[PDB]
């Protein structure tokens, strides 16, 4: 019920008629209290973000965007690692899942990556990845 998997399953539920902030916020807060919380979150998020069901991926991206705003280095570092960024690159790059992914889900990933390269220049890997997608003509 309070486990990350149960929270993410509610926050990114394909059935939700509208964003569920309670569950999304609860999810961000729940990860900020565990040394293993962040790694498990990014892993669970990469999966949801890659779902063929657009409303599932959009809500997962909404969760990623939200937790990045209210979290420390613990989660900011997990997203900064290529271990996570690659899963996003996979979703927007046609060379992988890019061709079958909704333009909406792709654009949102690109807004986030940019938003982070600006508000978090520290995370070089995020910028480094964002740059590659830009030179690659994907942006």
């Amino acid at each position: 019920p309070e486990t990350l998997e149960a929270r993410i399953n509610r926050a990114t539920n394909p059935l939700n008629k509208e964003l569920d902030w309670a569950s999304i916020n609860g999810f961000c807060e729940q990860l900020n209290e565990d040394f293993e919380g962040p790694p498990l979150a990014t892993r669970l998020l990469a999966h949801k973000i890659q779902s063929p069901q657009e409303w599932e991926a959009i809500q997962a991206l909404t969760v990623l965007e939200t937790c990045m705003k209210s979290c420390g280095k613990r989660f900011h570092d997990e997203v900064g690692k290529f271990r996570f960024l690659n899963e996003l690159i996979k979703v927007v790059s046609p060379k992988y899942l890019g061709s079958r992914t909704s333009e909406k889900v792709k654009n949102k990933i690109l807004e986030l990556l940019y938003s982070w390269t600006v508000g978090l220049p520290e995370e070089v890997k995020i910028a480094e990845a964002y740059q590659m997608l830009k030179k690659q003509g994907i942006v």
Partner: peptide, 7 residues
């Protein structure tokens, strides 16, 4: 503790 950027 991390992987290489997707080529």
């Amino acid at each position: 503790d991390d992987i290489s950027l997707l080529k």
